[PDB]
Symmetry: D2
Subunit: 267 residues, 4 copies
């Protein structure tokens, strides 16, 4: 019955067992999917390999999206080990920490380029590299955040990146849609991850989300993973170009929640 049985997917972005990419891969594996994984470097490879093993996969490849020379070997590895792809998970972003503190006006050009290149252009290069391998009905998923279309506290240049990323999803949905290939973004609420811990005062965002979200909770890793799996699976074959919020409902809020502000009850 598994909704990805016999389906083959590449997972780009696992860092540890907290990675959103890991939550999605786990839900996919529980639905019968055959998986491959990339790692950025040798230190992360020692985390990615045991994770890939718990999901029955020896297919682990190096990929620094900033290094163009890594893409043709990736294509060769996937083609040799999997033959073709039913889905890709693009779960990678980076902006230097100093660009996320302070203000947007204060962003350097190289911080701007790095954020755009790693968080946005990497989806274009990854999908173009792997496009010949994509089967009929395949699904490409990337990860985004409400900071793209609303101000969120000192997301700054990443908000610009995620806005361009969501636009990319719409143009790629059209480019690939004539090949019966879907492209979507999962917009997750804040969640504790390796990249999360690199943002100063991230716990304030997580706490503000928890108190003010309709469901009065932060989202779990498994909730993000299950939504990803849905978008990657044929259940969502009528869905493309979509930005899907998995955020405990936080996106509907136009102001702080009340009862007196819930935030003030929290004191």
């Amino acid at each position: 019955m598994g909704f990805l049985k016999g389906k083959k997917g590449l997972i780009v972005g696992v860092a540890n067992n907290k990675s959103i990419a890991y939550g999605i891969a786990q839900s996919c594996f529980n639905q019968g999917a055959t998986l491959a994984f990339t790692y950025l470097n040798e230190s992360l490879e020692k985390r990615v390999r045991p994770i890939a093993q718990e999901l029955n996969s020896p297919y682990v490849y190096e990929l620094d999206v900033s290094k163009e020379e890594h893409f043709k070997p990736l294509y060769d590895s996937v083609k040799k080990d999997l033959g073709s792809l039913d889905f890709i998970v693009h779960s990678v972003a980076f902006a230097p920490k100093e660009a996320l503190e302070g203000s947007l006006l204060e962003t350097s050009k190289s911080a701007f380029n790095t954020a755009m290149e790693i968080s946005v252009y990497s989806l274009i290069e990854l999908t173009n590299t792997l496009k010949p391998l994509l089967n009929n009905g395949a699904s490409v998923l990337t990860l985004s955040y409400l900071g793209s279309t609303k101000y969120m506290a000192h997301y700054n240049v990443m908000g610009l990146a995620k806005a361009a990323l969501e636009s990319a999803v719409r143009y790629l949905a059209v480019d690939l849609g004539k090949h019966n290939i879907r492209v979507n973004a999962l917009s997750a609420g804040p969640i504790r991850t390796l990249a999360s811990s690199g943002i100063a005062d991230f716990r304030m965002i997580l706490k503000w989300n928890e108190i003010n979200a309709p469901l009065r909770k932060n989202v779990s890793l498994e909730e993000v993973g299950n939504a990803g799996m849905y978008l990657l699976s044929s259940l969502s074959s009528g869905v493309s170009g979509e930005v899907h919020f998995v955020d405990a409902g936080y996106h509907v809020m136009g102001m702080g929640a009340v009862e007196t502000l819930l935030w003030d009850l929290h004191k």
Copy 2:
């Protein structure tokens, strides 16, 4: 395995085996759901009852949302037969035929009130009635359409209703989030139903969507059904207040698709 096993849901809006509510019920049934169904009147009861039997349900209750007298007996029936509810499908709209022709400027007050009462207020009354029966984690789903937020050919008052409906989803999400209850809308692309076939512009809107959608297809009933099942199941427990597009990607288009010549002109 079934993502609705042991879960009890009320299906409001089956008219025949082409109804959106039927597609959703069918997917929910295949995921192990215990279902109950309502019927508008005795004429529609003749088609709802065989569909309910097909989906293993002896629970068939009367509901004309315009008749307040039906709501408390519906409550009694559900509590006595099922005890509680884990999800509610609200798949009901109506506007006078003449209102969806011509222009919005010509809409009578009575036709405006009918569209709003049947298509929007009914969600409030249905949810408030059944709220004491809603289990922790329950999911309320309504059905909407892109004409709520963009102009669609002669949608008129129903675009006003659908806009109000999506706003109701947001406020209800906040209202019920307190109790870990989710409220969402599935925004389907055009699909041939009994109600949709009652519009003169439908064939052409259906054809416009087919040619110009990224996936170059109209959505299937099973595709709408599965996305609905997903929003009703715990797989989407991090999702609330969402307007979820199941429209073959059509929502992203800002103009006719091209190839420069319009794809429309080639056909």
Copy 3:
């Protein structure tokens, strides 16, 4: 040079000199418009008449949007007095106080219908009535609020109404655009008006806007008025179907504003 010089407009919704309809009327007058005004009943006429005179207008008519029988005489009055109309300001809404407290869940059916009829269908009926008087190039403006598309504390049924109202703006802009007639919505931040005062939830929403808005201020009546005059004047003749925020930037905010110090965030609300 007055951007509305020689243009004739009808202002629906003045209740006193704090009304959004008055701020808009005043900026229109200052841009040279010839104005007429409506009033809900004789009580409100006592305030509308001196305002009308203040803005150089002797054309003051009764209009309760819930009474169909008022609309043809309104059409006849305007036709007889002004001949034709270059703009309309629809600045009218109502919901029973009950409904703007507590949850949307407990909204009665009568309160829902009242809210929808007064706040939304009135724009359809008003525009349909006056439509044969509208000149080429005319501009129709209604007022909305962010509670249409985002949750705002206890706005409830009025959020549903404003959502449908913004949708009506899009449909009417298509219907009327064939005649070079424009239809827009001005979405204002909170501001104290007679109708604001009825909501017991309001001083807090105002203060939350003031603290958290990009410009760290509530909008003034003059700023709402000037934006409206813009949308009503030919300066905005390329603009139709728009929901235009005049709210000190509040609409962009995904969360409370913060003060940044030593790489650490403190919500401005918490310093407040």
Copy 4:
């Protein structure tokens, strides 16, 4: 005089008398503004200098937004000649012509970086450079297009950049609102300009906009200029972080326009 009398404004992006920046400048001048202008290179200075002069401006500075050595000179030139600024017009974009052909999937990394740097980061660098000269109540305006949030044919990386640009408008509005400074985007419908004419797809996008827009017309240069002038003036002092559509209503359409059950384009 008008709603910009005594107000000092920098206009970045005039290419000729068809430029959006020109139409906005012209409207601002008719409202009594003191104007100053930038040009890309000597070729473009040949048309910016006469235009600045018909708008009574002796202040004409070089600014290639890809050369950061130009930016403190610009700061110095402005500080000396005008002392301060009440508004800035950022009317600049570029992507390699190949990148607006075909598909987004074939976009090269250099093409992507050029588009992002010219079209987006330049707003950040220009505003940060000029921030100490901005007076209370100043207004910063940039230009966007519906391709940011909707698919438009072959708009490709410019869609990604305009999406990032509108996000930047929101963050800059928060950053600068502390000092009562406003930041907005004007989202114009298609209009024939020097940059736009060099796209194969444009004529058809114009004609599609004209047939299907609620107002059944394309927008004029003066309509875009007047809306820009409004956003730059005290008339809009309650408006910040806004994406303001000046497109004859086109943005509202969810499909082609029809008529009693036939597409207007088919009658065309």
